[PDB]
Write an enzyme that holds these catalytic residues in place. Structure first.
Site: not given
Ligand code: HEA
Ligand code: HEA
Ligand SMILES: [Cu+2]
Lengths: 534, 102, 269, 59, 47, 113, 121
Positions: A62, A92, A127, A157-158, A241, A243, A245, A256, A290-291, A316, A319, A438
């Site tokens: 998954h 091209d 993951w 590739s990327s 992280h 990635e 972004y 935009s 920060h994790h 954030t 924007k 979990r």
């Molecule tokens: C990329 C980020 C991402 C996204 C989008 C999702 C989407 C979802 N994830 Fe997952 N998930 C992770 C990232 C993500 N997840 C990660 C990192 C983990 C932890 C991994 C682990 O530890 O192993 C995790 C784990 C995780 C678990 C934990 C597994 C467990 O131990 O059982 C579960 C549980 O059910 C879950 C559920 C879901 C569900 C219901 C969605 C739903 O949102 C799904 C809905 C998505 C769709 C809507 C896709 C549509 C498909 C299309 C055909 C696209 C069409 C588009 C065009 C090309 C035009 N996710």
């Molecule tokens: C779309 C990508 C995305 C975005 C935007 C964010 C946004 C943020 N994330 Fe998150 N984050 C992830 C993707 C993202 N994260 C992923 C994949 C993980 C899992 C990784 C791992 O832990 O396994 C994760 C996990 C994660 C953790 C891990 C927790 C732990 O340690 O286990 C933490 C901890 O600090 C964190 C912090 C934040 C913060 C502070 C923001 C902030 O930047 C949010 C910004 C938005 C706001 C600012 C709020 C709206 C605006 C306002 C109301 C303005 C005024 C407010 C203030 C300025 C205070 N993120």
């Molecule tokens: Cu970060």
């Protein structure tokens, strides 16, 4: 006739082919995630006879499939190779051989990962591949090696695609175009490509090191032998992280572009936020850790990391308010791109709210690895990637095909995915506050109703995917009918109360690029003349 | 940056000197009404005569109902009423007696 | 038709393509390599020569494809500044990626400087184990490579300036030195230090040297294929592809090799 | 030389696929890279043919 | 290589064909949409 | 005589940009030649003697201090290093091959039967 | 089948007809005949300035109104250009589509643009 679909020197064929591959991977991932949620619908063994090994095998399948074959390829490749060298006036794009090599090394990854998932042992560490969790003792066989090879080839590739985009931006710029006033999409792709170029090699080196450990049986990150797997953990964080972004920022650029070409007004603080995005790209190498607040770092290090992670969070909200002003004072239409962008922005505001709630380090002690963190990143990644891709498709299908798409089907599709996402994601607050543990194939039956509603939402999403494929069939079979009648939207933007019918007919689109009024994709020799702009 | 607004007005009159069809009238009306500035009766009359240079009564309906519904401006009515009354009595375009009773 | 001629011969660098299955057969060979690796992981037959033969034929196929494609590049003509600059930029990107791979591999074993480990070591060197020391084995190879790099730091530029009998002498001495290098690498092939099966304490330097030798192997292979291309009368002083890369090859190679030689040989012993 | 001009003239007067360049190499490679490829691919997934037929039924 | 107008030929499939009027290949796509998880389950367990 | 009707769009009139590009390319070539000359001179002056001296002293020290492992095959168990759990531990069973069931025939890694 | 002097900037047509004789002994010749393909024409053009696929800017500074609309030197039927003001920048760029079937408008300048062929027999 097959060289077009095997040796495509043009970017558009590669773009649509990447789109097809990504949509296939996404539908497979959605179906198998539905299967997983059905397994987690009720505690016990109702459809799968336990098999926690198999459970984690499909869990990692998954995660890895959707991260590496759905979000990445199409969302960057198609938009990049269809806009970035086309709007600038280049005839091209260069390096067709590099793109073909990337495509033809991809099936190595697909087949190897299929074999890795379809062996008796398999790799099921999720993951996270940090040893000794990813040790060969538990996950034996060739699964780890095949996964490593797929990682390497996908990274290559990327990286090569990013290099091609970067060189196209740096060299193929037209004479009449300033650098400071580039469109937000161009700068978004620029920042994404540079972050990818500075992030993928580190993860590739770490993955190569793990491959050497697994093959030559050396001692680098194993606990026995004086190893430090935390080095590879930090490498994986500094990949993921940036990635994250990489996955999100092109979505920001797409939103935009949509709002700029639809709302008929400039984006508030366009140049200022171009500079802000440049600052984000430059400072992303400082908020990657920060994790790891619980690994055992010093208190001062915790303070530095938390200070960085909430001092780089302002853009954030910047924007959010900038796009709010962009839709403010203008005309908003009841079109699918408007609602897609609105839903994406709203759910992204909640996701950022949860992230800010996670920003504090003191609360992390009782909040880390709870349900709240996984709910947070599922929020942000799911809405970001899925809604950005959906908005891109529903906003770009007449741009690349010219065959209109039904408005009613698009609206019911949006409603289905939206209600499914809301019903799935609302109870996660209660789930987090209770502390759902979990990654358990047989969780305690206390959360039975919430698991039931999550399964209902997942099945709603799957029938929505069936609606997606049926909508594709309907378009392919009745694009001519859609063009003939009003069953589908004909024009992107509605006229204002200033325009006569003839004037609007001869001024249908006033955008920042000729792509909208560019005819359906011409032959491989397009843009024979440079683009002049003043 | 609170830039000058009379420069765009002078652009409107210099395009009026170069006006060649109703297209330019549409463009200048859209540009003028897009701005936050409320048009004075002088520039309103200039736009009206630009629209009437082709003698298109529907354009007169457009400009009059746009004046009636240009900007909320904290719901300004009485000024709008007197302005529409005078820009009507100058030439005479009775239309509010038809669409309103609907 | 003069405007049509200029728009078709200068703005249209497109080359005709017929339905050649070369990419799909290349992918098929890659899949053959993948299944051979899978068979090595698990197999019911104990033969060893079959996987070696598969790898050798895959390498020969790749070399044949490279020499073929440079043959059509030199043969079809239709060369402008666009194609030359594009291929030069692409090759520079490839060598930059190779440099980054070198840097990552170097940092893989360089990171043990402050000794942040927890137990069973945590202070390099982890005294207590007397295994086979990897030092002093490849220093002859690295010093002779240093001598070759020193003498070819601008020999390529001398070749491109002169392209005379001195160029032939430079190519001959390059062939002789690379043959000497591959022979001195081949002398210690199987019984170099020991069998890599168990008890690893200082095999990291040997593994690094073994993985670094591969890039020198394809360097020799590309030099040989370039010489054979000149033997085919295709790479003249026109749209040169071998020269445009070999001019900067030494400059991009010597820096990274000096970085890898100042340490990793004078440090960690 | 005395053969490059002749080859160029032949190619100009006769445009054909496969480049008319490696006929013996093509005959040595493609039929072999088909027959031997089948002979090396098919047994790996044909060994479990006897085991094939698993209904996940136990007593 | 330069004979593609770009109206219906951009798709990497052939619309023509009586045996496959986008009915057999797309039914195969239907099958492969759920084929991989089903076979993954079937290899080790039952569906 | 090629058929030309009027002109194949020779283009806009020339300017000093082309000659500036020519000057830049010539400056690059001259810099390359000058750095070639200077680097070759300094290398043959200093580096080659220093590199040769380092090579010969390294060869001497390698011939001196790296030749005591020849007799390691036969040695009494009196000066054995103080080993521990780091060595003499179980590993994955190995079935490939025939000779001693080892990946490479190097019966020197373990001195315990 | 005769040798061509190729001393004229326009009398050369067809990279296949150019081969380039070799040299027995001496020094590397100048970049006039040793270059293969048609790259020698391009490098000579960039050496002097007279170029094909010219990147020189058009009359962007010119308003290009009905008094003197801008010119486009290309025989291709379609047009991919833009004009949104005489200065370097004053508004978001909108593309212009000069054509002979109908007229074009600028929406900020209101310019009617006329596509410019090249003389043909
Ligand atoms: C990329 C980020 C991402 C996204 C989008 C999702 C989407 C979802 N994830 Fe997952 N998930 C992770 C990232 C993500 N997840 C990660 C990192 C983990 C932890 C991994 C682990 O530890 O192993 C995790 C784990 C995780 C678990 C934990 C597994 C467990 O131990 O059982 C579960 C549980 O059910 C879950 C559920 C879901 C569900 C219901 C969605 C739903 O949102 C799904 C809905 C998505 C769709 C809507 C896709 C549509 C498909 C299309 C055909 C696209 C069409 C588009 C065009 C090309 C035009 N996710
Ligand atoms: C779309 C990508 C995305 C975005 C935007 C964010 C946004 C943020 N994330 Fe998150 N984050 C992830 C993707 C993202 N994260 C992923 C994949 C993980 C899992 C990784 C791992 O832990 O396994 C994760 C996990 C994660 C953790 C891990 C927790 C732990 O340690 O286990 C933490 C901890 O600090 C964190 C912090 C934040 C913060 C502070 C923001 C902030 O930047 C949010 C910004 C938005 C706001 C600012 C709020 C709206 C605006 C306002 C109301 C303005 C005024 C407010 C203030 C300025 C205070 N993120
Ligand atoms: Cu970060």
């Amino acid at each position: 006739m097959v060289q077009r679909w095997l040796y495509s020197t043009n970017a558009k064929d590669i773009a649509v082919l990447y789109f097809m591959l990504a949509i296939f991977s996404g539908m497979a991932g959605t179906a198998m995630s539905l299967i997983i949620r059905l397994e987690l619908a009720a505690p016990g063994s109702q459809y799968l006879h336990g098999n926690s090994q198999l459970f984690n095998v499909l869990v990692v399948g998954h995660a890895v499939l959707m991260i590496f074959f759905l979000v990445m390829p199409a969302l960057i490749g198609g938009f990049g190779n269809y806009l970035l060298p086309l709007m600038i006036g280049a005839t091209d794009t260069a390096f067709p051989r590099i793109n073909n090599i990337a495509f033809w090394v991809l099936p190595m990854g697909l087949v190897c990962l299929v074999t890795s998932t379809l062996v008796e042992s398999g790799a099921g560490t999720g993951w996270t591949v940090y040893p000794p969790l990813s040790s060969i003792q538990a996950h034996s066989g060739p699964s780890v090696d095949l996964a490593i090879f797929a990682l390497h080839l996908t990274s290559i590739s990327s990286l090569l695609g990013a290099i091609n985009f970067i060189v196209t931006t740096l060299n193929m710029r037209t004479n009449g175009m300033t650098m400071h006033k580039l469109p937000l999409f161009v700068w978004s792709i620029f920042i994404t490509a540079f972050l990818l170029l500075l992030s993928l090699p580190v993860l590739s080196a770490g993955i190569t090191m793990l491959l050497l450990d697994r093959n030559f049986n050396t001692s680098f990150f194993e606990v026995s032998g004086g190893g430090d797997p935390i080095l590879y953990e930090h490498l994986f964080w500094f990949f993921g992280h940036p990635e994250v972004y990489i996955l999100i920022i092109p979505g920001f650029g797409i939103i935009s572009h949509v709002v700029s070409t639809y709302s008929k007004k400039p984006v508030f603080g366009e140049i200022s936020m171009v500079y802000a995005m440049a600052s984000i790209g430059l400072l992303g190498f400082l908020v990657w850790s920060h994790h790891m607040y619980i690994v055992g770092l010093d208190a001062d290090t915790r303070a530095y990391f938390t200070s960085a992670t909430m001092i780089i969070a302002i853009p954030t909200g910047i924007k959010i308010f900038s796009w709010l002003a962009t839709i403010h004072g203008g005309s908003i239409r009841l079109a699918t791109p408007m609602l897609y962008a609105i839903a994406f922005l709203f759910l992204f505001t909640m996701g950022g709210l949860t992230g800010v709630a996670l920003a504090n380090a003191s609360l992390d002690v009782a909040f880390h690895d709870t349900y709240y963190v996984v709910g947070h990143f599922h929020y942000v990644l799911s809405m970001g990637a899925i809604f950005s891709l959906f908005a891109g498709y529903y906003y770009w299908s007449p741009q690349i095909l010219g065959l209109n798409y039904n408005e009613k089907l698009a609206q019911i599709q949006f409603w289905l995915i939206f209600i499914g996402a809301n019903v799935i994601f609302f109870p996660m607050h209660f789930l987090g506050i209770n502390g759902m543990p979990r990654r358990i194939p047989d969780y305690p039956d206390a959360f039975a109703g919430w698991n039931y509603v999550a399964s209902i939402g997942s099945f709603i999403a799957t029938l929505s995917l069936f609606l997606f494929i049926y909508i594709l069939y309907d378009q392919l079979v009745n694009g001519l009918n859609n063009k003939v009648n009003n069953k589908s939207v004909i024009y992107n933007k509605a006229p204002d109360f200033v325009e006569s019918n003839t004037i609007f007919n001869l001024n249908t689109v006033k955008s920042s690029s000729i792509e909208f009024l560019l005819t359906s994709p011409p032959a491989v020799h397009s843009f024979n003349t440079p683009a002049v702009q003043s | 940056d609170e830039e000058t607004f009379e420069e765009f007005t002078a652009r409107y009159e210099k395009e009026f000197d170069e006006a060649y069809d109703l297209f330019e009238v549409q463009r200048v009306l859209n540009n003028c009404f897009s701005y936050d500035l409320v048009p004075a009766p002088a520039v309103i009359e200039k736009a009206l005569r630009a629209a009437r240079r082709v003698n298109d009564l529907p354009t007169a309906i457009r400009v009059f109902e746009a004046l009636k519904y240009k900007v909320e401006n904290e719901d300004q009515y009485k000024a709008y009423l007197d302005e529409l009354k005078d820009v009507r009595q100058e030439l005479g375009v009775p239309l509010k007696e038809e669409l309103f009773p609907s | 038709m003069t405007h049509l001629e200029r728009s078709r011969h200068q703005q249209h660098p497109f080359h005709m393509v017929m339905p050649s299955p070369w990419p799909i057969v290349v992918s098929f060979a890659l899949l053959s390599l993948a299944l051979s690796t899978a068979l090595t992981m698990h197999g019911y037959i104990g033969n060893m020569n079959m996987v070696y033969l598969a790898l050798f034929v895959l390498l020969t196929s790749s070399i044949l494809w490279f020499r073929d494609i440079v043959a059509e590049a030199t043969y079809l003509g239709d060369h402008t500044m666009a194609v030359r600059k594009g291929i030069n930029l692409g090759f520079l990107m490839f060598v930059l990626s190779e440099v980054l791979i070198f840097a990552g591999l170097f940092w893989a074993y360089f990171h043990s400087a402050m000794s942040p480990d927890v137990t069973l070591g945590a202070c390099w060197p982890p005294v207590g184990i007397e295994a086979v020391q990897p030092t002093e084995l490849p220093l002859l190879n690295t010093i002779i490579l240093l001598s070759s790099g020193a003498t070819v730091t601008y020999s390529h530029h001398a070749l491109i300036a002169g392209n005379r009998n001195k160029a032939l002498s430079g190519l001959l001495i390059t062939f002789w030195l690379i043959v000497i290098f591959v022979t001195c690498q081949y002398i210690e092939y199987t019984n170099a230090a020991f069998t890599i099966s168990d008890g690893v304490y200082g095999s990291v330097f040997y593994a690094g040297t073994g993985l670094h030798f591969l890039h020198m192997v394809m360097l020799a292979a590309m030099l040989g294929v370039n010489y054979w291309r000149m033997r085919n009368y295709h790479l003249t002083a026109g749209h040169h592809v071998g020269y445009e890369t070999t001019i900067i090859y030494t400059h991009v190679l010597d820096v990274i090799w000096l970085f890898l030689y100042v340490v990793f040989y004078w440090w960690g012993v | 030389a005395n053969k490059v001009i002749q080859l160029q003239k032949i190619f100009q007067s006769s445009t054909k696929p496969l480049w008319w360049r490696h006929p013996r190499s093509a005959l040595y490679l493609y039929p072999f890279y088909a027959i031997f490829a089948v002979a090396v691919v098919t047994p790996l997934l044909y060994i479990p043919n006897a085991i094939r037929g698993i209904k996940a039924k136990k007593a | 290589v330069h004979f593609k107008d770009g109206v219906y030929e951009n798709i990497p499939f052939k619309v023509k064909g009586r045996k496959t009027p986008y009915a057999l290949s797309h039914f195969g796509f239907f099958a492969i949409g759920f084929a991989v998880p089903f076979v993954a389950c079937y290899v080790q367990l039952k569906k | 005589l090629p058929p030309n009707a009027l002109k194949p769009a020779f283009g806009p009139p020339d300017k000093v940009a082309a000659q500036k590009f020519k000057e830049s390319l010539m400056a690059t070539e001259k810099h390359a030649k000058d750095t070639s000359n200077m680097w070759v001179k300094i290398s043959v002056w200093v580096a080659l003697p220093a590199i040769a001296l380092t090579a010969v002293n390294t060869y001497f020290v390698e011939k001196e201090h790296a030749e005591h492992r020849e007799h390691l095959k036969h040695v009494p168990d009196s000066e054995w290093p103080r080993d521990y759990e780091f060595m003499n531990i179980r590993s994955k069973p190995f079935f490939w091959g025939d000779g001693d069931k080892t990946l490479f025939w190097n019966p020197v890694v373990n001195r315990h039967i | 089948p005769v040798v061509k002097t190729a001393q004229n900037l326009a009398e050369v047509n067809g990279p296949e007809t150019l081969i380039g004789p070799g040299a027995k002994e001496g020094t590397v010749p100048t970049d006039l005949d040793q270059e293969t393909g048609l790259a020698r024409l391009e490098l000579l053009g960039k050496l002097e300035g007279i170029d094909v696929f010219d990147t020189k800017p058009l009359d962007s500074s010119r308003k290009g109104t009905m008094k003197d609309p801008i010119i486009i030197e290309s025989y291709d039927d379609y047009r991919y250009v833009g004009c949104t003001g005489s200065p370097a920048g004053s508004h978001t760029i909108m593309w212009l589509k000069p054509t002979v079937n109908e007229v074009a408008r600028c929406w900020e300048c209101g310019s009617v643009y006329k596509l410019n062929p090249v003389g043909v027999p």
